[PDB]
Every structure is written in structure tokens, then in C-alpha cells.
Design an enzyme around this catalytic site. Structure first.
Site: not given
Ligand code: HEM
Lengths: 189, 401
Positions: A10, A14, A36-37, A80
């Protein structure tokens, strides 16, 4: 850690699929990306339930329905589905240690990913050569998922060895060189 | 004890209305039921450009000699145009009553549009519009009219687009003049020290020649983002009832209840069976959303919970404001001309007081729920309006859970 993940985001907001600064066009989240979600939650619930209530054992393994026998060992053992890509890599490297390391790198190579970005454009919407390399990366990730399943015998092994070599070479070498070439095509480099 | 407004009618259909009073100066005007609503997008600035040309000389009084006459008695000459009405009015002394009427006769008929003048008034109008953009609240109310009455003749402005202004010719004007200046659509209104019989005789002598021959509220929003402006102007409106619907009075009381942004003004603009009822506020960017929230709560409140006392406040407030008798002659007549054009009669102040005192809290919240609750508004913003909420948030603020 997910709360920390949301905070560290934040601060920056995004990203958008064009990869450009979207500050001129931003909308609220409550009425636009909430419904949308909710729709995405409903579709994901449709797929889960239809993978529990109709095909409940599709993703599992039958040998897990036997009790744990230390004296016997399931003849065909496999991780798995999700852990397979890694499994393939591990099996590919001849050295045990090498396998473990490569395996780790398999996941870690991602962390290393923000230091490999050599392009002046953030997204791949306007970058076709790196799009082709990305879909080849998704392709041999699917190949490594398949190989893990296959047993140890020709020619599954060679594919595994190549697929791992191609995976690490596309992420490490081919994408920054392609980004340099794409910057050269737009008279930027 | 207020003197009644007496109305007569000539054969032409020009209703000659007058309301005598002691004051020795009078405001004699001609109202015409002709505005931008009667224009058909090919003559969108004809009324405005004729309003510019109407004081530049007639056939009988060529050029500035005409205005020399209205200097000679020390009278004041004014004209204005709205989307539905056009007015040409003179403030003068009582003893100069005949010549003033004769002057008004020239202004409505026998007028002369000089081609030379047409180019000069085009540069005046063009330039003013080129600088009119400066007045924000005018820009915001024009945007509100456009986005609320999309596709109708009520969206187009009184001035028209520069395009038409440049592309206009005597004949076109002549048409608008010969088409929308009919005698049955005209009221000769007089207020102050005038006798009705003398004014009727003067209207029979001159002005006896004048020839005798819906809208859809698109709830939507227009936002002109320009971040270099220091302040933001936002107008939010819903559909009004019209001129002839009596609950307007009740709605006026509701506006008197409302009366956080540097400037907050409520409006009830009425046209022929339509209108815009709402609020315009001018604010710094970082306050805008809070204002909107504030404003919607009030409206919703009135629709949801309104006490007896505040109603009394509005009743009284409106009463004093509605009071216009002997407010000014110019106002007085303006009221005679608009009353004969819109209602077809002059509503006396006693009838207004009766319609005010019959308003209570229950019918006020009923009429407010009829016109404000769960309605799609028209939104017009100009300035740094990024924090101005989009249409879902405003539409959700138009009701309470
Ligand atoms: C289960 C574990 C994870 C959860 C619950 C999670 C949750 C979220 C959430 C809620 C957002 C807000 C934006 C969106 O959902 O599109 C987000 C953004 C992001 N996450 Fe994750 N994430 C997880 C794991 C990861 C991993 C492993 C990566 C890297 C490979 C990652 C990279 C990102 C990036 C780069 C954003 C920013 C994308 C954008 O908003 O343009 N996340 N994540």
C-alpha cells in the site's frame, strides 16, 4: 506475514497490466474491486466444491489410504503435484547436495528476479520477445511438473536435465538479454 | 393589503400586466417565452446574439441615437436571457412612462440588425465566451445541465458553442426573431408608479402589432479535471418537479433548512415540467469527499428524520425571502413577467403564505423522499476533483441502509 505483505504494498499501490503510472486513472475499491473479488471468490468456491463434492480424490493419491508401514514402501512414490517441479530439479542434478541447492534456488531464483530487470518498460504488455520467453518458461515448468511424475528411466531423465537447464537459463540469462534487445529495437539503448 | 396584480390581454395575445404602487419610478419590461430550450442546435446562440444586437439601433431610431433617448430621461436599460425566458426591462420615472413603452416596442419589433454590428457583437460574444470559462460556477452549472439533460435542448447553453456564434447570419437571427417573438408568448409587465389603464392604452397604441403565430433527466456526471485551479466547484442535483407543481414550495422550505465547504448554496431551478434541485459547493481538493458525505447526510436526514422546529425555521426563512413585494421594482416586475409566462397568472403573496403554512414536517419528509431518496443524481465537477467520489459512492450516499 501477509499483513506485512499488504503493508509493504500500500506504500506503493498495486501495478497495472500496462506497467505504466496509473495515478491519472484510479478508482475506489469498495464498489469496483470488491464486487469483483466477491465474484472471484464465488468462482473459486465453484471450482473447489466441484473438486470436493464431485471429484474428491482427483488431486490426491491412492496409497495414502493405506496405513503407514515402515517395513514396506509404496512402490511408486511421488510428491503431490505442486511440489513436483522442484522434485524434478532435485532428481536432475546428479549430486545430492547439488540437487538440494538447485531445488532451493528454484524457489529462490524468484527473489533474485528484481535484480535481473534490465528493461525500461515495467510490464510485458508491449514486449513480445520476452512474452515468448515467458511462455516458454511456463511451458517447461509444466514439463518439469510432468517429469517429476514419471519414474526414473529413459528418456524422462534427459528431459528433466534439459528442462532444468532451460529453466535456469531462461530466468538467469535469456530474459535480460532479450530486454536489452527490445530496448535496442525501440531506439532506447 | 398588498395590491393585486391586474392582467389584461390584447388581441395579439400580449398580456399586459401591471402592479401599481406609490414609488414614482417604474420597471417596465417585456418577457418572452423564448430561450435556449427552443433552439435546435443550428441556432444555439441566436437568443444571446439577438440580446446583444437589440440595443444597437432600430429602423425608427438608427444606432446610438436610440440609447441617447434612454440617456435623455436618465433611465436604465437591461436585458437577460435564460434557457426558457428572455427579458428586456427599463427602470425609469413614472412621468416618462409612454416613451419607455414606445422604446420597448422598438426593441421587440422593428428592431434592426446591422451587418456591421453583427461582426462587432460576434467578437464581443466570442471574446466573452473565450473568457467566460473563467467563471467556474458558471462552468459547473453548464456542465450539470449538459450531463443531466443529455440529448435534449435543455443541455445546450444560453450562449451556445463558439461554433454557432461565428456561424450566424442576419437571416438566421431574423428567423429566431420572427419565430420566437410571437404576441401570445409575450407579457408587458409594469411595477411601481404606473396606472394600469394608461399602460393598457400605451400597449394598444404601440406593441399592438406583434405578430400572432418533453425533457429527460439523464442521471450522470461530468468532471473537468484541471489541477492548476486553486479551488474546486461541485454541483449535485436531482430532477425537479417543474413550475406548476405546488410541492416546489415544500422543496423551497427544504432548501431553507440547508441554506464544511467554503461556499455552499442550494438551488431549485425550474423549467417547464422539469428542473434541477440540488447543491453547489466550492472547495479545496482535500475536503471535497467529506463535503459530499456531509451534504448527502443532511438530505438523507430530511428524508429520514426531520423535526418540527427546523421546519418552522424554513417556513419562516422562506417567508422572508419569498417576500419580494416592495423589495425592488425590478424584482417586482420580474416576478410579474415570470408569473404570467410560467403560471399564466400572478400568484399573490397571500396564496404563497397559505401554501407555506400548510407545509408541515410529515409532508416535507414525504416530498423529500419522493425527490431525493434513492434517486440518480447529476454531478458536475471542475478543478482539482480527484478526491471527488465517483458515481457509485455518490449513488450509495443517496440512500441509507
Ligand atoms: C499466499 C501467500 C500470498 C498472499 C496471501 C498474497 C496476497 C497478496 C495480496 C492480497 C496482494 C494485493 C494485490 C493483489 O492481490 O493482486 C498481493 C500483491 C502482491 N503479491 Fe502477493 N501474496 C502472497 C504471496 C506472494 C508471493 C509468493 C509473491 C511473489 C512471487 C507475491 C508477490 C506479490 C506482488 C508482486 C504483489 C503486488 C502486485 C500488484 O498489486 O500489482 N505474493 N499479494
Amino acid at each position: 506475514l501477509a499483513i506485512v505483505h499488504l503493508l509493504f504494498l500500500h506504500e506503493t499501490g498495486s501495478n497495472n497490466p500496462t506497467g505504466l503510472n496509473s495515478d491519472a486513472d484510479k478508482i475506489p475499491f469498495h464498489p469496483y474491486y470488491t464486487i469483483k473479488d466477491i465474484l472471484g471468490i464465488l468462482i473459486m468456491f465453484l471450482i473447489l466444491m466441484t473438486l470436493v463434492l464431485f471429484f474428491p480424490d482427483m488431486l490426491g493419491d491412492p496409497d495414502n489410504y493405506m496405513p503407514a508401514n515402515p517395513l514396506n514402501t509404496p512402490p511408486h512414490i511421488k510428491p503431490e503435484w505442486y511440489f513436483l517441479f522442484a522434485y524434478a530439479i532435485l532428481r536432475s542434478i546428479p549430486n545430492k547436495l547439488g540437487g538440494v541447492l538447485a531445488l532451493i534456488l528454484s524457489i529462490l531464483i524468484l527473489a533474485l528476479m528484481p535484480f535481473l530487470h534490465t528493461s525500461k518498460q515495467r510490464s510485458l504488455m508491449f514486449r513480445p520477445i520476452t512474452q515468448i520467453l515467458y511462455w516458454i518458461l511456463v511451458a517447461n515448468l509444466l514439463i518439469l511438473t510432468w517429469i517429476g511424475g514419471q519414474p526414473v528411466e529413459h528418456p524422462f531423465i534427459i528431459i528433466g536435465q534439459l528442462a532444468s537447464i532451460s529453466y535456469f537459463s531462461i530466468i538467469l540469462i535469456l530474459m535480460p538479454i532479450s530486454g536489452i534487445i527490445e530496448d535496442k529495437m525501440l531506439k532506447l539503448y | 393589503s398588498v395590491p393585486e396584480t391586474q392582467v389584461s390581454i390584447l388581441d395579439n395575445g400580449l398580456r399586459v400586466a401591471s402592479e401599481q404602487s406609490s414609488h414614482a419610478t417604474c420597471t417596465v419590461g417585456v418577457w418572452i417565452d423564448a430561450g435556449s430550450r427552443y433552439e435546435t442546435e443550428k441556432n444555439n446562440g441566436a437568443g444571446y446574439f439577438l440580446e446583444h444586437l437589440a440595443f444597437k439601433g432600430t429602423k425608427n431610431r438608427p444606432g446610438n441615437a436610440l440609447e441617447k433617448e434612454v440617456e435623455s430621461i436618465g433611465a436604465h436599460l437591461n436585458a437577460y436571457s435564460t434557457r426558457e425566458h428572455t427579458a428586456y426591462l427599463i427602470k425609469a420615472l413614472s412621468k416618462d412612462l409612454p416613451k419607455v413603452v414606445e422604446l420597448l416596442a422598438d426593441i421587440v419589433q422593428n428592431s434592426s440588425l446591422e451587418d456591421s454590428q453583427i461582426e462587432k457583437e460576434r467578437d464581443v460574444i466570442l471574446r466573452e465566451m473565450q473568457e467566460n470559462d473563467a467563471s467556474m460556477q458558471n462552468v459547473v452549472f453548464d456542465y450539470l445541465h449538459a450531463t443531466a439533460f443529455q440529448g435534449t435542448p435543455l443541455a445546450q447553453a444560453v450562449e451556445g458553442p463558439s461554433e454557432n456564434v461565428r456561424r450566424l447570419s442576419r437571416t438566421d437571427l431574423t428567423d429566431y426573431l420572427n419565430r420566437h417573438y410571437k404576441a401570445p408568448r409575450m407579457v408587458l409587465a409594469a411595477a411601481g408608479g404606473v396606472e394600469h389603464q394608461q399602460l393598457l392604452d400605451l400597449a394598444q397604441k404601440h406593441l399592438s402589432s406583434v405578430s400572432r403565430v418533453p425533457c429527460r433527466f439523464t442521471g450522470s456526471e461530468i468532471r473537468h479535471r484541471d489541477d492548476a485551479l486553486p479551488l474546486a466547484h461541485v454541483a449535485i442535483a436531482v430532477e425537479g418537479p417543474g413550475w406548476a407543481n405546488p410541492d416546489n414550495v415544500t422543496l423551497q422550505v427544504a432548501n431553507a433548512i440547508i441554506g464544511l465547504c467554503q461556499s455552499f448554496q442550494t438551488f431549485n431551478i425550474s423549467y417547464s415540467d422539469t428542473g434541477l434541485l440540488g447543491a453547489h459547493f466550492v472547495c479545496d481538493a482535500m475536503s471535497i469527499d467529506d463535503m459530499v458525505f456531509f451534504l448527502q447526510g443532511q438530505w438523507m436526514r430530511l428524508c429520514t428524520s426531520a423535526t418540527e422546529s427546523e421546519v418552522t425555521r424554513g417556513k419562516n426563512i422562506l417567508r422572508n425571502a419569498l417576500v419580494s413585494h416592495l423589495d425592488g421594482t425590478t424584482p417586482v416586475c420580474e416576478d410579474i413577467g415570470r408569473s404570467l409566462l410560467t403560471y399564466g397568472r400572478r400568484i399573490p403573496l397571500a396564496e404563497w403564505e397559505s401554501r407555506i403554512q400548510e407545509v408541515d414536517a410529515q409532508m416535507l419528509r414525504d416530498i423529500c423522499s419522493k425527490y431525493f431518496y434513492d434517486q440518480c443524481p447529476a454531478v458536475a465537477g471542475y478543478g482539482p476533483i480527484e478526491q471527488l467520489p465517483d458515481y457509485n459512492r455518490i449513488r450509495s450516499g443517496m440512500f441509507w441502509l
